[PDB]
């Protein structure tokens, strides 16, 4: 019955991971967040030291037993047109 | 998420003509078509639990 503890576990998991990811990327420059993109975002989700060093392989929520085995981020969008074809002059 | 539906679980070797949208360390957004040469593996093809 602890499974149904949170009634919106999907939203709870998304909000918690999003919050912690945003907070951790907040401490790094754009250059760092794009060099070690997956590295810092994956240590953001479950920041610890059990493997600089890699953190773990389990993001567990004790409220309902929901375990986020891994966190995958697809593409960095940045929406504004000024990161856009101005980093495109950087391309050139 | 849910497009195909069939009564049979294909265990034979096959592939998935999937395309991903990845981003490298140079931020280079590129899509790329994948195959995923896969096949199911069963060491004991009679055991109810494994099957």
Swiss-Prot record, chain A:
Protein name (Swiss-Prot/TrEMBL): Major vault protein
PTM text: Phosphorylated on Tyr residues after EGF stimulation.
From-to range in the entire protein, with total length: 559 to 659 of 861
Record gene name: Mvp
Annotated localization: Cytoplasm; Nucleus
Notes on the domains: MVP 3 mediates interaction with PTEN.
UniProt subunit comment: The vault ribonucleoprotein particle is a huge (400 A x 670 A) cage structure of 12.9 MDa. It consists of a dimer of half-vaults, with each half-vault comprising 39 identical major vault protein (MVP) chains, PARP4 and one or more vault RNAs (vRNAs). Interacts with TEP1. Interacts with PTEN and activated MAPK1. The phosphorylated protein interacts with the SH2 domains of PTPN11 and SRC. Interacts with APEX1. May interact with ZNF540.
Protein role: Required for normal vault structure. Vaults are multi-subunit structures that may act as scaffolds for proteins involved in signal transduction. Vaults may also play a role in nucleo-cytoplasmic transport. Down-regulates IFNG-mediated STAT1 signaling and subsequent activation of JAK. Down-regulates SRC activity and signaling through MAP kinases.
């Amino acid at each position: 019955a602890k499974l149904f503890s949170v009634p919106d576990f999907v939203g709870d998991a998304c909000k918690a991971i999003a919050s912690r990811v945003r907070g951790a990327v907040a401490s790094v420059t754009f250059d760092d967040f794009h060099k070690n993109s997956a590295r810092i975002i994956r240590m953001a989700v479950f920041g610890f030291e059990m493997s600089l060093p890699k953190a773990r392989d389990q993001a567990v929520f004790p409220q309902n037993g929901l375990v986020v085995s891994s966190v995958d981020v697809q593409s960095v969008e940045p929406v504004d047109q000024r990161t856009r074809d101005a980093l495109q002059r950087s391309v050139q | 998420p849910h497009a195909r539906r069939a009564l049979c679980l294909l265990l034979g070797p096959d592939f998935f003509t999937d395309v991903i949208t990845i981003e490298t360390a140079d931020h280079a957004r590129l899509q790329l078509q994948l195959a995923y040469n896969w096949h199911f593996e069963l060491k004991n093809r009679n055991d109810p639990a494994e099957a």
